[PDB]
Design a protein around this ligand. Sequence first.
Ligand SMILES: Nc1ncnc2c1ncn2[C@@H]1O[C@H](COP(=O)(O)OP(=O)(O)CP(=O)(O)O)[C@@H](O)[C@H]1O
Length: 279
Amino acid sequence: ELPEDPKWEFPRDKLTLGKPLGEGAFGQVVMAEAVGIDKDKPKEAVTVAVKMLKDDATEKDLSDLVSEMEMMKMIGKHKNIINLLGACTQDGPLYVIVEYASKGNLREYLRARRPQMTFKDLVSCTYQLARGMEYLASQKCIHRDLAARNVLVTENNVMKIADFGLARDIYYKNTTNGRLPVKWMAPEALFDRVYTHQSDVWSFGVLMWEIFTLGGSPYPGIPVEELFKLLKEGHRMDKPANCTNELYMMMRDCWHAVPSQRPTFKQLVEDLDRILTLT
Ligand SMILES: Nc1ncnc2c1ncn2[C@@H]1O[C@H](COP(=O)(O)OP(=O)(O)CP(=O)(O)O)[C@@H](O)[C@H]1O
């Protein structure tokens, strides 16, 4: 039932599934070996990650996995985003083949290095993620689910933005009864059901907070049900212990009530470049 797309199709006999990397909401991800998936090296086997449906998959899971695949097709290549490598869509189960990150997600990566991480490492991480998001915004893509659990870390410690299941090509009108994680969402997205690049910028501020707390959970002790009201009233998180004033002012700026008053990803890249260049 899935229409052909030769540019992205990859032969099943060149794909060898291996160890499971983890299951989530609507699917499963497994490590695999793909032979010749790098066209400029057709005989090499490269370790990749494959996203597929589970046995208890719903019809919605299938269209979601397809929709996620289609987003990643139009996004483009970049060092700081998990990139689509290919797909097996014909004569069998849907396999979405993406770059493999051996060190898992940033949240767990940071939590397991709690006392090891230097301050500059954290600034580097933040810088890389700002770059991925700058590129992403330049492709007119809003992520809508930016968070530490959705960043993946490679063997060489490159930060890669992942999980494009909620990403959209663009204002955008969010649906009522939202499917966006509340603690990472800008007030516009939550209250006005609108989404812009500046909405991702707010999420990035929460991402910054996660990074400098070495994987802390945002708005600790505050139930999701009460968070809506507090944000209206101007509630914001505290400065993490391991954070300069400069970097804290950056977070607070990403958390400006007025979207146009928040920095752009290009601005954040500029500032983070400067801060990294020192340090
Ligand atoms: N390209 C990749 N390389 C290595 N591990 C990956 C990966 N893609 C996903 N994973 C891992 O497989 C698991 C499933 O992620 P998935 O995105 O499919 O579900 P999910 O989004 O509901 C969990 P989360 O919301 O925290 O990202 C995750 O633990 C993730 O760390």
